[PDB]
Swiss-Prot record:
SUPFAM superfamilies: Helical backbone' metal receptor. This is High-affinity zinc uptake system protein ZnuA. Induction: Maximally induced 30 minutes under zinc-limiting conditions, still induced in stationary phase. Zn(2+) binds at residues 33-34, 96, 160. InterPro entries: Bact_metal-bind_prot9, Lipoprotein_PsaA-like, ZnuA, ZnuA-like. Keywords: Disulfide bond, Ion transport, Metal-binding, Periplasm, Signal, Transport, Zinc, Zinc transport. One of its GO terms (biological process) is zinc ion transport. The keyword Secreted does not apply. Part of the ATP-binding cassette (ABC) transport system ZnuABC involved in zinc import. Binds zinc with high affinity and specificity and delivers it to the membrane permease for translocation into the cytoplasm. Disulfide bonds join 205-259. It comes from Escherichia coli (strain K12).
Length: 263
């Protein structure tokens, strides 16, 4: 099996590995990429994996040590891909790379290349999977593009700084984020800054996330006319499979649009 660190990385892997091998995801639904420890049984899972796919050391702290034990031939470190480095946006870069369709393409190519070397017998199927992934993703980019276009100019805050690659591609205009690190709670001042910005900049929405209780987001919005939505950067509701990455980006767009559309 291909073992992916995070569900959306698994979505990409499952598009390429479909009908070739299984895909498994380490980080459970509901858990956060920023605050996690591997299960004791995960050591053996990573050792037995055909391929391990992850973003990198500045993202999944929990992956670095086990990954270092593996052959280079058996891992894809997305953030370190030569085609990915020039696409990194800010000496710190944002590491939520799975929400970049272009980085998803680079990842798919990387996975395709490692799996064709490990399993030359599967070359035809892997080739077709790569071509189908591209076709699906292109269609989704068009659809998402058209869904999000009318939402340009509607301001909003998100809970943590996870969406930059997606927002940049699709032209959304966020006012900002509650936190960078979603475990660390926002200060009373920051919450007031957001509440002030919210009223002054006439924001449409604030977004919670399923991984964290929305109380603090609800409090910034108490008494205001700002709507409340939820974004899921980790695709908890989407199941792994050939079309999962497309379904994920479509759902995320749907989550923005559900709150932002109108009034
Ligand atoms: Zn994050
Ligand atoms: Zn910030």
């Amino acid at each position: 099996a291909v073992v992916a660190s995070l569900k959306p990385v698994g979505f990409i892997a499952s598009a390429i590995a479909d009908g070739v091998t299984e895909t498994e995801v380490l980080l459970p639904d509901g858990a956060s990429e920023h605050d996690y420890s591997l299960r004791p049984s995960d050591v053996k899972r990573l050792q037995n994996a055909d391929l391990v796919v992850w973003v990198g050391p500045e993202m999944e702290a929990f992956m670095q040590k086990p990954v270092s034990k593996l052959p280079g031939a058996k891992q894809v470190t997305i953030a370190q891909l030569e085609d990915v480095k020039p696409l990194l946006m800010k000496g710190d870069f944002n590491m939520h790379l799975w929400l970049s369709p272009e980085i998803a393409r680079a990842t798919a190519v990387a996975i395709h290349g490692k799996l064709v070397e490990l399993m030359p017998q599967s070359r035809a199927k892997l080739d077709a999977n790569l071509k189908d992934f591209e076709a699906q993703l292109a269609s989704t980019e068009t659809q998402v593009g058209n869904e999000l276009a009318p939402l340009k100019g509607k301001g909003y805050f998100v809970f943590h700084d996870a969406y930059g690659y997606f927002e940049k591609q699709f032209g959304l205009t966020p006012l900002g984020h509650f936190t960078v690190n979603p475990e660390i709670q926002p200060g009373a001042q920051r919450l007031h800054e957001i509440r002030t910005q919210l009223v002054e900049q006439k924001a449409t929405c604030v977004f919670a996330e399923p991984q964290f209780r929305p109380a603090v987001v609800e409090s910034v919005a108490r008494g205001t006319s700002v709507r409340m939505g939820t974004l899921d950067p980790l695709g908890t509701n989407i199941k792994l499979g050939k079309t999962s990455y497309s379904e994920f980006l479509s759902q995320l767009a749907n989550q923005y649009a559900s709150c932002l559309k109108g009034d």
